[model samples]
Target chain A: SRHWPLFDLRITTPRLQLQLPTEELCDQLIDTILDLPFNTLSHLWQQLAGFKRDDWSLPLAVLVDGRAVGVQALSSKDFPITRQVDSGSWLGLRYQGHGYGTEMRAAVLYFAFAELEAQVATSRSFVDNPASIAVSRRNGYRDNGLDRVAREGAMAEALLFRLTRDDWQRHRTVEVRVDGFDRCRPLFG
Target chain B: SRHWPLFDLRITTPRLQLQLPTEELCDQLIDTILEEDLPFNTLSHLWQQLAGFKRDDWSLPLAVLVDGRAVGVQALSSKDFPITRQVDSGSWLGLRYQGHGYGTEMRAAVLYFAFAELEAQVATSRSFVDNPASIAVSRRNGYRDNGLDRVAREGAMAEALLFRLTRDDWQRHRTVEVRVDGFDRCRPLFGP
Candidate 1:
């Protein structure tokens, strides 16, 4: 942890604490990923423990009262020109249907807009997943567009949502504090 | 040149021709960039890149011509475009040609080519939030608001509004009659 100060860049909301995943925390995240029907996400959990600074993805483990409950991530291809990032998240089966989803997303958005100076943050979910859609709206994302993707060999529609920094300021509900960002700034680029 | 059939593909509208630029046309595009006060114009840098372009890079820069005279340039670029099947467009019009609706028409012409010819599933475009004229072009072509991007323009930070039009939505805006020429020869460049 001495060489990698990014581990110290922690975000805390009233109900959640988001931080870079440790090996033990990643194991907990793998447990949550296994509960989902999709096996494609398992690799994401596998890579979280050894992520390098220059990697495009920034995956964080969401904690509630000191227990890992879920995962939230922001990824970009070329952040300088695109200045846009997309979010993906999942929670343990026991943690589903609670207010933690909204709170966890708000925490990451705060770090994205406030700390990272991102221009826009985007998220998408299957059209059938109302819970994910509700969480995005609560965090100030508006409907952007839709895409039809092949999931599990079946055609499914994905609802895309976006939030600009200005829109986030207007619709933001949760207050978040990020610590140790100064030391980990270079890791983001 | 035998391996690069994409250079032969051309799309013609009632008033404009969109095709891969020749060396002379690239010179004209550079001249237009220098004449404008647009801070985001990176023609000099772009010209350097264009000179070294390859089929796998997936950037298609087309010269926009009206009546045999170069007016501007429009481009469709992406990474792994064949796999993603999405394209992003950007264009620049000379100062003399700003208000004549050429911008809107040129965009429609390219969208037609992208969807009908290239079989792109999604086409996206963006403009600085302060520039409503550019935004108007996207809206007229049936693009819905997709997202936002921030960029450094003219030594200051700017916000860009992203728009996307799907193949189905593009069907509704098929008012432009774009005639394709020599496309079959270049079909392989776009992949199977």
Candidate 2:
């Protein structure tokens, strides 16, 4: 597999910049995570490790205008089963409801389906996570079914969703262009 | 914040075994895969990796067994943003039923809503290589088109059709026979 630096990948929509985060910036993301008492650090770290990749963990530092306010990421892996690569993302709490999560996530959807040529990019939201599900819907992901598991102190359920490139092309107006990935493309292989 | 191995998980249907796969039986599973190629490799690997995990990696694998033979799989992955969770599954080729409706029966059998059993607002599915039968399952279950994407395979690319089902939609399409246990204690994680 090939690898690339987070600095090399950048995704921009009409009102936001979604790019890979530097190690230093990722630390900033952790700090942001610490700010939320309701947000479980263990769960967050678990998700980070689960989705992180050397070649394509594009942890976007959500920039409204060159100022970092939140973080989101688009991760890729050789998901051999579905025969498709999958992606997941998140934004800081303060950045919630301003539509930055949707914007940044849409940017990731563009990169995953359009640029990466993924047959389907899947994302899941907790059964109660309307904001997250809303983001997926806005970016063309649809609900499939419930996924159940024990989390923290009790079992939890998630609503699964998927988006294909064609659906993305039909519903999305945001144009995503990647720059300087030649050095990083190998890592994806 | 908590973790469990395959031993702690159990997924059941009236006449199936959707349990965790053990390492000693990998070849049996692979053989099943080679015979039908229904899930394709990408999906198989996803199940393999999830099954290989000692403590489960957010994504859990449950082998779909029928008549005491491995036939397919169901998977559940962790979600952080909406603080929600989700599931995905695929069946083997040898298991296709008459009128191309077995997929529907199995899907309905699992009852994704019962599995989650909460304020789940949405769920999704994707079908590639233009499988009309699979597409029909989603449509009949009240899923609508979300979008499509070009997915890369072992040595090729294919188009995938995406679909989604919302809580409101699922409510309308409710079949009523679906049931799940232990969901009352599961609703707190998502804050509903």
Candidate 3:
């Protein structure tokens, strides 16, 4: 698909503002990363550095009433051919009890299928990653299967999952709206 | 759960290659993408591109090998979190098998019981460019209703049909095998 400037594609949920990040906001993202008990590197850090071409630009730094708490985005390279994108995200360790992860993910899906026009979006988690999978399932993604993924130099069986735009609309619970992107829609074409 | 890498994860059919892709044979992927005569920029393209992730990357790619031929590849991967365990896949049907039920059987043979074996709650799929065959397989497998996905690809725009199957749904529909060798060591990552 065609690429467009991040501009002002913004979405708001009851507790967060999902907006494309500006250069100045890079620190906010770094801050969110540092807050994680375990570094979200390897998978996410590389994604952040290799942004834009990787379609990792416009990382949605999740701001809960103005404080960055987490990060999420559609990360991939051959986006046009893929039509499907993968999403990655992380919230501060202290913010675990709240529903920030799910809310942020829901926002990502809104942009992925509803706004970005992604046909299928896939995600994966370690079999023990119940919290991540729960958010994915709640957001309408389904388990596709599993395979061993090497993490931190160890082999772990990763759970694969997917969600299409049609399923997202069917499972959507919170109201979502896109603003200032009608012109960008043409860019997507 | 932790991430691990496995090799030669191949599944064979009478005349198909449903395993991971090697760097040299990637271009042939176009055949798989165009197999069903679906739109050029459909969701199938996504699977083809993701097939390129490193063999040990987050979503490991498997080449589908049928009768010594490599037709398409699919993947099963995990998320960054450590709680809700799950798995998902991306596939393609050769042009000749578009109408035959091979695609359905291929999907059932591979994805079914994947979650239950891993102790997961659901399985899902998305079809775009109006792929009735994929939609039918998902529906027949008792996948619950979900919604549509609007997509923007390199050359086209589309809306995909999404579907999901839960553990209960699988038990109610068909028998399946999620056989594995190193599962005992991996079982801890899938703990309840």
Where's the lowest-lDDT run of ten residues in candidate 3 chain A? A35-44
Candidate 3 docking classification: incorrect
Model 1: residues >4 Å from true position, as ranges? A9-15, A31-58, A74-86, A110-122, A147-157, A163-189, B35-57, B78-86, B120-122, B166-173
lDDT of 2 by residue, B68-112 (tens): 676655544434413443334444434342254445655654445
Where does the lowest 10-residue lDDT sum fall in candidate 3 chain B? B1-10
When sorted by lDDT, best at the front, the candidate numbers are 1, 3, 2
Worst 10 residues of 2 chain B by lDDT: B1-10
Return the TM-score for each candidate structure.
0.73, 0.51, 0.49
Q: Can you write out model 1's per-residue Cα lDDT over A52-152, one digit (the tens) per residue? A: 53347778889988778888887765565556778999888889978999998999899889988888898999999999999998888988776655566
Task: Judge the docking of candidate 1 as incorrect, acceptable, medium or high.
Answer: acceptable
lDDT of 2 by residue, A15-58 (tens): 88766555555556666665353353444444445543323344
- The native-contact fraction of candidate 2 is 0.05
* Per-residue lDDT of candidate 3, residues B5-94 (tens digit): 233334443444454455444545555555444544533554555544432223645555555554555556555323433456566656
Better of 1 and 3 by DockQ: 1
Top candidate on DockQ is: 1
State the lDDT of candidate 3 residue by residue for A62-144, as single tens digits: 78778777777766555665577888776778788688888888877887787777778888878887899899888888876
